[PDB]
Amino acid sequence: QLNPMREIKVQKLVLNISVGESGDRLTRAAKVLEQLSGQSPVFSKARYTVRSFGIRRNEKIACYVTIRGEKAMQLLESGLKVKEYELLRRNFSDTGCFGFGIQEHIDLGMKYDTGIYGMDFFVVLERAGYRVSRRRRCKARVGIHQRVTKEDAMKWFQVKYEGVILN
Amino acid sequence: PKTKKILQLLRLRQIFNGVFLKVNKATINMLRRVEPYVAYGYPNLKSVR
Amino acid sequence: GRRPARCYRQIKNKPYPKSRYCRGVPDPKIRIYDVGMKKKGVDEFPSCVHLVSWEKENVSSEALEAARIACNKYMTKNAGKDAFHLRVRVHPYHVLRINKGMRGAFGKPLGTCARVDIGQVLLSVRCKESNAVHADEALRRAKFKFPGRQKIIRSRKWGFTKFNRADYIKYKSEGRIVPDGVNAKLLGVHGPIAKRAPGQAILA
């Protein structure tokens, strides 16, 4: 259906950095997200003690941030440019979300010569009316005709960033 | 004790004592609980007189 | 060895299963419950005979295994290893205690036994009609391993199903029985209509 309310837009983009420890590495990791977003990043603690990774309970090991609006549009454009608009078929989840990775944030543009850091890009695609599942009063499911699935998300990437899905 | 009480309400305190009982649901279910201790039936005019 | 079965023959206690409150229980002697051709189609064996217990008593795991072996060996020899299916219909779930003076006499586990009642099927054999007489002989040999009184009864059902032979055949002609091993589920009139197949959807 060609309803004008049935247009896919980026709900939010989440930049994840997972260092695995705390100290100067985490602080320099956070500053990179500060530069690329303009908002204070939020740290994430560890939930289990795992000897192989060398992490204890309630230890700061990662950091992330949520961006929405034109800023997340430009960040996704530059991030997908690093891939040269070459995603993968597996990269798309079946709920209408996809992501990729960046090995080095220098390709995003900032010189940062803080150090050498990568990030996990994840992007949530949604249509209008998704508020019904997040508003406090009268919560409800968003309805299958208003949901974004893998077919729409893959089509959305093909025609917006001239991207090609690899197999 | 339950058999002892019911036979007191029917006034059957001794063996070979006899009484007249009028029939209703209340009395009949009283009689069913003391069935092994008693013999009864429907009397006729010759018996009553 | 162990005490004679007369010491535990009568059902005197409440059931005492192996559980979190009863630990250190030796394993049952009987571990196999189906012998012969177990993976035989439901349309192959229409003959069914039962060894039915006529007493309410305990039956040990030992007595169950001995009867299974004795019933099995005659059937394979006198009818063929391929001509029958024999099923033990009782599982030993009761734990018997032994107190090895009377101070603190609660006993430790001794063995496992089944609790059976009158009319309870002990053993079942499904074969073909030509071998039904041999089926009575193997059940007759098996009953000497059990305490108490047992009967051998010719079942009216087709094989191990719950269907009488007069009605299992009637359903088969109508195209209303789907064979799942030995169970022969009788499809009916419920569920999605698209779930059925051409010829397998019946009104009422």
């Binding site: - | 029939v23 009395t27 | 010719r154």
Partner: protein
């Protein structure tokens, strides 16, 4: 105390009924109780304040006091030779109004109306209940009669 705690052997008694847990309906909370009324006591295990002892579950008693969140209930307890009129306070969640006199309350109004008519007409009546008694004679027309017979015994169909 002395071998058994307050809620001993109440595992089934104080449990909630199946698929009837969670919220407590508003009807429980805005029923009105007055002194002299009859109420049944039924503990519910989700409300722990005002909880009566397990003896009073399933007993009916009179209301003798009313407070903000509870009512006073009078319940008979047999202690050896005699009955002790126990007086306990229970929160409204564990109490429901009793219907042990509902049939009596309506009957009393009806007996008043029936005796009112006898006053107008000048008659004398009873309006007193009588147990079910012997049925009067009656006739039944000639219809079909089905014959019932003992059935021959079948061994196979006994199970």
């Amino acid at each position: 105390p002395a071998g058994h705690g307050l809620r001993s052997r109440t595992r089934d008694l104080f449990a909630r009924p199946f698929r009837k847990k969670g919220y407590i309906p508003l009807t429980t909370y805005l029923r009105t109780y007055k002194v002299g009324e009859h109420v049944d006591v039924k503990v519910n295990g989700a409300v722990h304040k005002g909880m009566p002892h397990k003896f009073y579950h399933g007993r009916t008693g009179r209301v003798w006091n009313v407070t903000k969140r509870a009512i006073g209930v009078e319940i008979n307890k047999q202690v050896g030779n005699r009955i002790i009129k126990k007086r306990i306070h229970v929160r409204v969640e564990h109490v429901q109004p009793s219907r042990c006199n509902e049939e009596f309350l309506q009957r009393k109004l009806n007996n008043d109306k029936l005796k009112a008519e006898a006053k107008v007409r000048g008659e004398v009546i009873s309006t007193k209940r009588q147990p079910a008694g012997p049925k009067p004679g009656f006739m039944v027309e000639g219809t079909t009669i089905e014959t019932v017979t003992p059935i021959p015994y079948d061994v196979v169909n006994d199970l």
